[PDB]
Amino acid sequence: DNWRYAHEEYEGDVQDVFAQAFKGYVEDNSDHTVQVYRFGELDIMEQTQNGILQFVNQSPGFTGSLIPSAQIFFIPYLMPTDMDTVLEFFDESKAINEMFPKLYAEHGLELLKMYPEGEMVVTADEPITSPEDFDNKKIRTMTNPLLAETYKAFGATPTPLPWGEVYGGLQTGIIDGQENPIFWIESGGLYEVSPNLTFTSHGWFTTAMMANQDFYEGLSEEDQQLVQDAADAAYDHTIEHIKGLSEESLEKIKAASDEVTVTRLNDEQIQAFKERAPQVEEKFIEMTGEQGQELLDQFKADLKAV
Ligand SMILES: CC1=N[C@H](C(=O)O)CCN1
Ligand SMILES: [Mg+2]
Numbered sequence: 001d002n003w004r005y006a007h008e009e010y011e012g013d014v015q016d017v018f019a020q021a022f023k024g025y026v027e028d029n030s031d032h033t034v035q036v037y038r039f040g041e042l043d044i045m046e047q048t049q050n051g052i053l054q055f056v057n058q059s060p061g062f063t064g065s066l067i068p069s070a071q072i073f074f075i076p077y078l079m080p081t082d083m084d085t086v087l088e089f090f091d092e093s094k095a096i097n098e099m100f101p102k103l104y105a106e107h108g109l110e111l112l113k114m115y116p117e118g119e120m121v122v123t124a125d126e127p128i129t130s131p132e133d134f135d136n137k138k139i140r141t142m143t144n145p146l147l148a149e150t151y152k153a154f155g156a157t158p159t160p161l162p163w164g165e166v167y168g169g170l171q172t173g174i175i176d177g178q179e180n181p182i183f184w185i186e187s188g189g190l191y192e193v194s195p196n197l198t199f200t201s202h203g204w205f206t207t208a209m210m211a212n213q214d215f216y217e218g219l220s221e222e223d224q225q226l227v228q229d230a231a232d233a234a235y236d237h238t239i240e241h242i243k244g245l246s247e248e249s250l251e252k253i254k255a256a257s258d259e260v261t262v263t264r265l266n267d268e269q270i271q272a273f274k275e276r277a278p279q280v281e282e283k284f285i286e287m288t289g290e291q292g293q294e295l296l297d298q299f300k301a302d303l304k305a306v
């Protein structure tokens with residue numbers, strides 16, 4: 001059979017590395033093919049829920065509108081800063097590995113893997129060292145309600161836009177900045193039009209890969225196990241890919257542009273942003289109720305454990 005798989009990124013980007021590794025495993029261990037669509041090549045969540053696509057890689061930044069619990073990743077300062085700790089969290093978290101699949105299943109999706117891509121970095125038309133520096137800045141975010149609340153809490157004017165409108169928007173001043181991992185800032189050339197990078201340490205860009213659940217449940221036991229084993233292979237390959245990637249990506253940006261500036265917030269500057277985090281957490285629970293509180297409690301337990 002041929003299984004269609006869509007993701008949000010371009011050739012060679014972190015989601016594509018995961019996708020090609022998944023494809024490779026399926027094709028090396030079966031007679032099936034995986035047809036991968038990169039960004040723009042086909043909405044993708046709609047097409048997966050209605051069965052046009054078999055697999056989709058969608059980030060909580062977008063899925064959080066449909067699946068409110070996925071907004072948890074946008075509570076700032078909740079996630080750890082360092083790669084090693086984040087990796088252990090994604091490996092061991094009940095919230096990630098048991099609770100989230102149930103929440104996705106409510107929407108007709110078989111959640112196969114969640115994984116990190118890289119630390120979130122702000123880019124803007126000036127260095128952002130305090131919430132006051134965000135005042136009257138239009139900062140583009142992905143399109144979920146809580147992420148807009150995070151940026152409002154930080155002092156910015158969130159301008160939730162889809163990805164396609166971002167480069168041009170920064171170029172012509174529709175927006176004043178954005179947030180993304182360094183590998184994407186590099187690969188998308190965003191540093192050309194948004195040259196001041198600030199490492200706020202507030203979060204990680206994370207993503208999820210899932211199947212249409214009716215499709216998955218219709219597969220033979222053998223093929224279901226093939227998919228699980230492919231997802232595991234892809235996860236391991238991708239985790240190895242992201243090791244050192246942010247550092248390499250930043251060196252590439254510095255090599256390409258003398259106009260780029262890098263601001264790393266110190267502990268005092270970080271605390272000023274962390275002061276804004278609790279009211280975001282309360283909005284998350286007001287958006288998700290007792291079920292959201294249960295997830296958040298487990299997510300926090302899991303972070304304590306690592
Ligand atoms: C890192 C990344 N950013 C996109 C965005 O900010 O819309 C979505 C796909 N991947
Ligand atoms: Mg100002």
Ligand SMILES: [Mg+2]
Pocket residue numbers: 135136
């Ligand atoms: Mg204002």
Ligand SMILES: [Mg+2]
Pocket residue numbers: none
């Ligand atoms: Mg150098």
Ligand SMILES: [Mg+2]
Pocket residue numbers: 255256257
């Ligand atoms: Mg040069």
